[PDB]
């Protein structure tokens, strides 16, 4: 899922580099909110057919992560695994192998 500690420029550039379709979603570190992160998904308006959206996330008080109150987890891997089946609160589900 995540490639490392990239998500603003690096991610937005690699997300549109090879032409990886929807589902290529990665996790990174927030530059404005440490301890939390922002989902970098290749989501568009369907007119451009090429764009990246940043979903600002918040860390759980009990020590976890959740994009929505309808699906909260404790680890990133567990979160990814659940969104890898379907969309629990995003524009698209996390269905992608790798793109290194």
């Amino acid at each position: 899922w995540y490639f490392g500690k990239l998500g603003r420029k690096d991610a937005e550039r690699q997300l549109l580099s090879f032409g990886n379709p929807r589902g290529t979603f990665l996790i990174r570190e927030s530059e404005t909110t440490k301890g939390a992160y922002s989902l970098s998904i290749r989501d568009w308006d369907d007119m451009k057919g090429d764009h990246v959206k940043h979903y600002k996330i918040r860390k759980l008080d009990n020590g976890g992560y959740y994009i929505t109150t309808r699906a909260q987890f404790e680890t990133l891997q567990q979160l990814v695994q659940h969104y890898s089946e379907r969309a629990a609160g995003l524009c698209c589900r996390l269905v992608v192998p790798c793109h290194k």
């Binding site: 922002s38 989501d43 940043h54 600002k56 994009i67 995003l90």
Partner: peptide
């Protein structure tokens, strides 16, 4: 302000 745009499916 950062470009934060959360899109849920509620």
């Amino acid at each position: 302000e950062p470009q934060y745009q959360p899109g849920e499916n509620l």
